[PDB]
Amino acid sequence: MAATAAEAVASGSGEPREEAGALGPAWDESQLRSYSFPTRPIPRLSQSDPRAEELIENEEPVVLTDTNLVYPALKWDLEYLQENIGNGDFSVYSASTHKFLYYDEKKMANFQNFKPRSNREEMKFHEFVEKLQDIQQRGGEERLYLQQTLNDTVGRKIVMDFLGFNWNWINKQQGKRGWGQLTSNLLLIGMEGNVTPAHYDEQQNFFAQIKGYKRCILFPPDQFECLYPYPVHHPCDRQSQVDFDNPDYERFPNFQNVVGYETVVGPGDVLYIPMYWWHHIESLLNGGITITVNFWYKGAPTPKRIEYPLKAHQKVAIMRNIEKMLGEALGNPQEVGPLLNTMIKGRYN
Amino acid sequence: MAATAAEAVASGSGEPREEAGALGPAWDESQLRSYSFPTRPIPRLSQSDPRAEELIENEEPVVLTDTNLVYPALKWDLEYLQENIGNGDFSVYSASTHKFLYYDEKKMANFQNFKPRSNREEMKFHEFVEKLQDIQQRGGEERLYLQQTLNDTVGRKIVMDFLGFNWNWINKQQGKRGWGQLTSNLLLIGMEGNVTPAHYDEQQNFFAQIKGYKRCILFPPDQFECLYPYPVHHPCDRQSQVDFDNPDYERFPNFQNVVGYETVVGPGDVLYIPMYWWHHIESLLNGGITITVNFWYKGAPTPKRIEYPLKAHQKVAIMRNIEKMLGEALGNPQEVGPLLNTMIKGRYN
């Protein structure tokens, strides 16, 4: 029965891998949050495996198990970083719930009624660690999530570790895929259970996991209809409006047609998150703090000759520009929706 | 009671004017078709009246009673034209109903499922008159509507009459309003009861009535939401989808908020139909054949500096371009609707 076959292929992230030296099961299935949609698994391949090279070429997700990308960083932990990370400022988001919804501050102007559920607070790494200990101590409920681009102000050891990254392999991936420059390296340190709601980025990404475990649920760009992103001018642009813990099927009916590609990454794994692909990231429950460093690259320029029919991500590019252009042309981003509705009601819908 | 005051201002075209020499009432109210919406009257002014100059400047409709625009043409009738109009071909639409819905033939390609309710047939003016007599003779039901741009192939008398038009007055109107060139002069000869469904043109127009009477119902460009034009790529682009004889309030709910500006024009009257203004034209029932010659002018170019907020017609210009651009970018006009719906469903609606 094809329905039975499908219920099997929705094997999730699969069986938890058994760590070396029989150190027991890496993670438990009960450490995963429960959702209302099926998910097939993202392939776990070797960087030498031709299939992995193929998936990256067709802009499809893949977890590379042996890149040694951030090998020197696999020894990173709070104590190490606190001594070597430096004394620069670190962006740290604080929330009252596990969901850390991103919000662009430049766009909060056009939406006064928007009240962010988490707050950003600059601080020194030791303060962050301190604040991390305090919550643990007082057994509080407050949650933190450090997200900071790595810069000039990192200790010599951190700089040394950087040199030990497998630049040879990633530089080639950049060159062979025609990708633009490396724009940044986001350091992500979050508490257990922390969740980064579904969204898509406008850059290619090599998600290098360093400490703890993260469950990554991805969705193809052709599932734009099922994820309902906020209006482009909204501070939550590029994020999904659908609450995964409580989907409003009335407002977002197509979310019942959604199918994800999930996987759990651990220390040493590198997940390729293709540009435009939606992704939901969560630090496993009771798995301790997680550490990740990503690599963001500008995408390849638009081809000289356009082929048809257009690919999904191209339509996404187009829909985004339409909203932008309208916003500029009407002089007020608030008039975008009314115009669009007027344009389609009784005409195209 | 404001509701009572409003029910009075909806005086329609008003009291029928009494022609000179006590030749009885020009037209009867029973010669008008019944519709489901209210209509205030379009002003009837003298070209020397400063108000008329004002309405034209603010791109608002007005009927000019004394322009002498097509004075030499006021003697035109079937016999005269048949002798002088020439032997060039004349576009003549034939329909089985009073509604003559315009349809662009260049766009019939993108819509195979479209079957026009009227057919165009080139013929000589005498043939047209002949065919006009035949239907009258056989007492048939078929309807005709001659609509032809006046060209080089008109007799010397028709050319002579043209010279007698009040070019002085209209040339100034062109110059003072910054309008482009005169693109054409459409000759319209239709049978009694014939109707040209609501639509808007992308050119400024001076509707010069020559024979018989026409009821002109206009709607401001800000009533775009209530008229539901066909998709830009549709052969019926710029026409309203709403059947005035039978409004589908389920598909077109905002048609119940529609308010028109109507008037009845007769020989000697010149109606200014501002660019983008919607208009419904009908040759009064049992009023005989009607003759009109319009003057189409390209509009003034877009201002150097754009002011805000945008005027209604500017938003119409924008909505049109969006549909055009999308059509080009997706390579298939049929994909426009699906993209627009995807862009707004659960996002802006």
Partner: peptide
């Protein structure tokens, strides 16, 4: 022409600026 215009992309990510 306009097609390229509509295809051009941004570089926004899950970070400020």
């Amino acid at each position: 022409e306009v097609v390229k215009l509509l295809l051009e992309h941004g570089a926004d990510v899950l970070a400020q600026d």
